[PDB]
């Protein structure tokens, strides 16, 4: 039975009914025209043109005969309609009882979402409830509608989100561009008694990882001077010894063996990288709440990380130089995070500002110390105080030959 | 500078309800506490009056000397445009911040005599780069004293609601129109749970 | 205004409840008035048959109307603002000193420390 | 003579109810034709109840002049174009029921003898006492905001209170 | 049944040289509407006044195609009770319909459609409080 084909049946009967009523109207309007002029105005146009007014007459007469079965029809019809009335009312109760049942389950599950203090809204025209699953945080804050699952007869939250699973994967790459080690972000498991709540967490977790990915993706465009490439699927940060750091959004023992030791190290690297990346994005989110109370360029998160790396690298290159030519040196860095009271402090601590590195290099035991204060900047740094003067140097290249000058004659 | 505003009122019992609803709709809140002192020159013009303001929300209450210490601002709050309905009240305010040796000693040299003082207390919410403030004006224990408790204006004082948006240039066309264009979006947002009409200041 | 809004929502809700509760009672009575048959002509009973059915249908729709109203009321009780946000299982609380050590350990990887000078 | 006026007046009352029902029938059809997808169930039901009230008036009107009508015979007047068109005359005067209505009677009569007066009055006298029971019992229950006035008086005193505090913040009137 | 029957005899008409007010009642005599009990059998419209009982008379005449015939009961030479009306239209005889049984029937036909129309459609829509009325 097609909905559109059900309409035709209705029109049919109502039209059979009309032509019947109208036919009765036609007969009586003709009969009345004999005694009133205005009465002929309810006869069909066709009848009006073809049949003259006062063409129907009537006489006093007839019994008419009384019918036997007709009085049994009247009794039957009434009795049949009154029992059908009971059946129908009892049918409509039985269906609507089970209808209130399935509605009861849906609302008991909805109370669980309100109990948890999750924001619930109705779209003006939708006439259906929706949760703000992206409640706690992130760039974009989307909602998901709650519905009864038609198949399993259970509940779920539908979303615009294109993925089931979504998590940031930061990995390291070979000279041959093989995965030397990786880290995919996980989440602390939250105990859920409600299947409806399980969904809400999974969705926030999905959206938040999408948010961090696109902010990372935006940053990649902003920093090309670090040789950073991107396909919108991967972010590749080229690092030392032809190695690469590939950042991507992932969607749908012995302890003494030198290779096993290295592998564990690279796991710690990727894990902390992911961990700092998330903390830094969190900080950027907190920054936006401050801004919303009164966005330019991109979030900082990817570049300070690059910066802190190149620091280890350049200071290590220096350590190599000073080792190659036996030179006693004391390397004293004061990392911002080292003195932090809590995590909200450590969050602000992960930043290029308030970072200095103090070096005391000894040309000879019988020569004065060369004090080097290293303070690099994100954009575009070496202060060397010796027995004679304080000198600032453009590059480590220059610093290294300035020391060379001080030692040589030995 | 020009200040475009809308005024409404929230009762003493409905404060926790309107603030909980205001919290859940717009970005915020932020704690606002100010010590205001007004000075009048030696009919009378209300626009010729000078209004000082000191943000003491993060300041110590037992602190003795704070008039030369806590930051002060000079406000020249004029009168709003006459015959205004279905639209927002508009009044120009001339702002000037100061940092000097003595603030309380200078103000009397000009010829301005002490008239009155009021303390602004409440929360400030932000959405669409236009501000909405739910405050209450209280009377202190001693004159020019941050010593609590603070006495309200009446036994059961209500909460004055002030929705302010700024446009620094009167000559500006789109900037002056956008503050009014966004106050429609503000008015419609708070109108569902609060009351806001046009009041003359 | 907000108070007029509160009044109007109560008014429209009441009216839809009233018309539904009336129809249930009114149409049920209508059936009882028509239920009488003895003395009636088959031509006069045939439309009563329709009436009696037409009425029972109206009664069901009036009960279904009450279910549309109770659904609104429930959605109005889930649209009111809650006082606080939801808690989380922050259990497995963060160890700051674990983090600090790993952070410097990596930052000083292969580098000789100052002897804390 | 005197009685012809009574039939005429009764037919004018009948002609009117038939006209009103034809109008609701045309209107029902009109509503159905617009959506071209079975119209909203409440409107289909809404228009059925309109018919209900229209047929209920007509059955009551026909039975009101039951004897008056039963005692009258319609036939063509000397003015009818009987030559050219007697089949439409025969149609206007068709006394026969719809085949589907005939079959209805036939089947409801079959089922009656398939299952197989004094108690007919007895059941009716019960339905009448039932209606009297209901209408009595309906009056033992009550069907269908001074707190709104308490909440309103709160607004007006606070508005006048607000009008006084704006003067204190500008001039200083206590 | 005679209420909805159409009787015609073109043979008699042809053999009598058409129908006129003079032979129209003799034509009606061959029809199953005519009762041989009637005062017409033993017996003109002047002689029927003197008699009592069932008598058939022409109440309206419009030749050569329309004649209205009335069966009646004569009480006296003044009072007469009309019984059933008939009409001869194009040599075909019909029994003038009863005002009630023709109107009541049309209204009975019209009401049948309504029940048939409602009963069918009342089953199709499904009600869900959240979804409202949907057509499956």
């Amino acid at each position: 039975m097609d909905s559109q084909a059900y309409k035709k049946e209705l029109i049919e009967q109502i039209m059979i009914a009309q032509t019947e009523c109208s036919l009765a109207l036609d007969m009586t309007s003709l009969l009345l025209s004999k005694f009133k002029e205005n009465s002929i105005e309810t006869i069909s146009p066709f009848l009006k043109s073809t049949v003259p007014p006062s063409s129907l007459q009537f006489s006093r007469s007839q019994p008419p005969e009384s019918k036997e079965s007709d009085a049994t029809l009247a009794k039957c019809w009434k009795e049949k309609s009154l029992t059908s009335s009971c059946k129908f009312l009892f049918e409509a109760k039985e269906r609507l009882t089970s209808v209130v049942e399935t509605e009861h389950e849906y609302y008991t599950e909805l109370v669980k979402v309100k109990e948890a203090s999750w924001p619930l809204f109705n779209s003006q025209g939708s006439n259906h409830l929706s949760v703000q699953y992206s409640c706690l945080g992130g760039i974009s804050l989307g909602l998901g509608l709650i519905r009864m699952k038609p198949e399993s007869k259970s509940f779920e939250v539908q979303s615009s989100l294109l993925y089931s699973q979504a998590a940031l994967k930061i990995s390291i790459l070979n000279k041959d561009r093989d995965e030397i080690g990786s880290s995919t972000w996980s989440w602390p498991s939250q105990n859920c008694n409600s299947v409806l709540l399980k969904d809400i967490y999974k969705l926030q977790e999905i959206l938040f990882e999408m948010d961090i990915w696109n902010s990372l993706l935006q940053e990649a465009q902003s920093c090309g001077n670090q040789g950073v490439n991107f396909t919108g699927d991967e972010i590749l940060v080229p690092i030392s010894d032809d190695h690469v750091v590939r950042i991507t959004l992932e969607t749908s023992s012995t302890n003494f063996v030198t290779i096993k030791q290295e592998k564990e190290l690279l796991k710690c690297l990727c894990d902390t990288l992911n961990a700092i990346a998330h903390i830094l994005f969190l900080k950027h989110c907190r920054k936006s709440d401050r801004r919303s109370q009164q966005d330019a360029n991109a979030p900082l998160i990817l570049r300070p990380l690059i910066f802190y790396y190149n620091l280890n690298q350049e200071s290590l290159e220096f350590q190599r130089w000073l080792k190659q030519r036996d030179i006693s040196f004391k390397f004293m860095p004061n990392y911002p995070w080292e003195k932090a009271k809590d995590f909200l402090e450590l969050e602000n601590s992960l930043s290029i500002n308030r970072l200095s590195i103090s070096w005391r290099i000894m040309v000879s035991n019988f020569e004065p110390a060369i004090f080097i204060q290293h303070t690099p900047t994100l954009h575009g740094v070496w202060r060397c105080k010796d027995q004679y003067s304080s000198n600032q140097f453009s590059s480590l290249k220059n610093v290294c030959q300035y020391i060379e000058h001080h030692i040589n004659s030995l | 500078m020009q200040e475009l505003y809308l005024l409404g009122v929230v009762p003493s019992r409905r404060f926790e309800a309107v603030v909980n609803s205001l919290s859940k709709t717009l970005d915020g809140p932020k704690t606002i506490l100010e010590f205001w002192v007004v000075y009048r020159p030696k009919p009378r013009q209300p626009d010729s009056w000078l209004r000082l303001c000191s943000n003491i929300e993060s300041h110590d209450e037992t602190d003795t000397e704070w008039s030369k210490n806590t930051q002060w601002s000079m406000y020249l709050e004029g009168n709003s445009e006459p015959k205004r309905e279905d639209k927002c009240g508009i009044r120009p305010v001339n702002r000037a911040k100061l940092t000097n040796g003595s603030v309380t000693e200078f103000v009397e040299k000009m010829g301005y005599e002490f008239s009155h003082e009021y303390i602004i207390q409440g929360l400030e919410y932000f959405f669409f780069d236009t501000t909405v403030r739910i405050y209450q004006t209280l009377i202190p224990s001693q004159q020019r004293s941050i010593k609590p408790p603070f006495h309200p204006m009446n036994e059961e004082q209500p909460w004055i609601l002030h929705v302010y948006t700024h446009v620094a240039d009167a000559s500006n066309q789109v900037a002056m129109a956008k503050a009014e264009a966004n106050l429609t979006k503000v008015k419609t947002l708070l109108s569902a749970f609060c009351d806001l009409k046009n009041v003359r200041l | 205004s907000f108070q007029r809004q509160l009044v109007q929502r109560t008014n429209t809700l009441n009216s839809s409840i009233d018309n539904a509760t009336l129809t249930i009672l009114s149409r049920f009575q209508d059936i009882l008035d028509i239920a009488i048959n003895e003395g009636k002509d088959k031509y006069t009973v045939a439309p009563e048959v329709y009436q009696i059915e037409c009425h029972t249908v109206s009664m069901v729709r009036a009960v279904e109307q009450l279910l549309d109203v109770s659904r609104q009321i429930k959605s109005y009780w889930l649209t009111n603002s809650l006082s606080t946000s939801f808690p989380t299982v922050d259990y497995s609380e963060p160890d700051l000193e674990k983090v600090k050590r790993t952070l410097t350990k990596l930052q000083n990887h292969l580098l000789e420390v100052s002897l804390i000078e | 003579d005197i009685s012809t006026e009574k039939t005429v007046e009764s037919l004018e009352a009948i002609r009117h109810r038939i006209a009103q029902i034809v109008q609701s029938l045309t209107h029902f059809l009109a509503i159905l034709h617009q959506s071209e997808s079975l119209s909203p169930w409440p409107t289909i039901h809404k228009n059925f109840n309109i018919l209900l009230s229209q047929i209920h008036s007509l059955s009551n009107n026909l039975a009101a002049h039951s004897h008056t009508l039963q005692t009258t015979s319609i036939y063509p007047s000397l003015e009818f174009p009987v030559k050219e068109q007697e089949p439409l005359l025969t149609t206007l005067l068709r006394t026969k029921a719809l085949p589907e209505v005939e079959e209805w009677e036939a089947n409801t009569l079959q089922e009656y003898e398939a299952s197989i007066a004094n108690d007919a009055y007895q059941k009716d006298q019960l339905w009448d006492q039932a209606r009297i029971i209901f209408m009595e019992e309906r009056e033992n229950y009550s069907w269908f905001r001074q707190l709104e006035i308490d909440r309103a008086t709160e607004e007006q005193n606070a508005n006048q209170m607000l009008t006084d505090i704006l003067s204190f913040m500008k001039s200083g009137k206590r | 049944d005679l209420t909805s029957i159409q009787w015609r005899m073109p043979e008699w008409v042809q053999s009598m040289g058409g129908l006129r007010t003079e032979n129209v009642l003799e034509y009606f005599s061959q029809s199953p509407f005519y009762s041989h009990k009637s005062n017409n059998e033993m017996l003109l419209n002047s002689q029927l006044k003197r008699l009592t009982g069932i008598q058939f008379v022409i109440i309206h005449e419009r030749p050569p195609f329309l004649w209205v015939i009335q069966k009646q009961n004569r009480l006296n030479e003044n009072e007469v009770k009309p019984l059933t009306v008939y009409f001869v239209c194009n040599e075909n005889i019909y029994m003038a319909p009863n005002a009630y049984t023709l109107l009541a029937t049309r209204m009975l036909n019209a009401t049948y459609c309504f029940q048939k129309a409602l009963t069918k459609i009342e089953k199709f829509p499904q009600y869900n409080p959240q979804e409202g009325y949907t057509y499956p």
């Binding site: 009795e79 209130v100 706690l136 894990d271 | - | 109770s70 009321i73 009780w77 | 029971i133 | -």
Partner: protein, 98 residues
Amino acid sequence: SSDTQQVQNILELEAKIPDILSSAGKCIEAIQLNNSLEDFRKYSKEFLETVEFISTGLRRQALELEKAEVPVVSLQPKKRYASTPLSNLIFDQSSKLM
């Protein structure tokens, strides 16, 4: 008293709403099938009771909505870029990785 509590009470009203249709048909069944006018008394009293219980029950709610001063319009949600339970959520797992 709480918003979730008032819904739990509506679910109660709702359970008894389809029963209006049963007790109505039951009345008709009393005279039509059983011919007992005293069953009709019982069930009509029952029908009217359930009808009144639900009617007043719902009007009690429409008023308690106005009493709780529940807003009419579904309001535009606020955009929290960061929250107190999200921060420590990140903080927990980030320490778990170090």
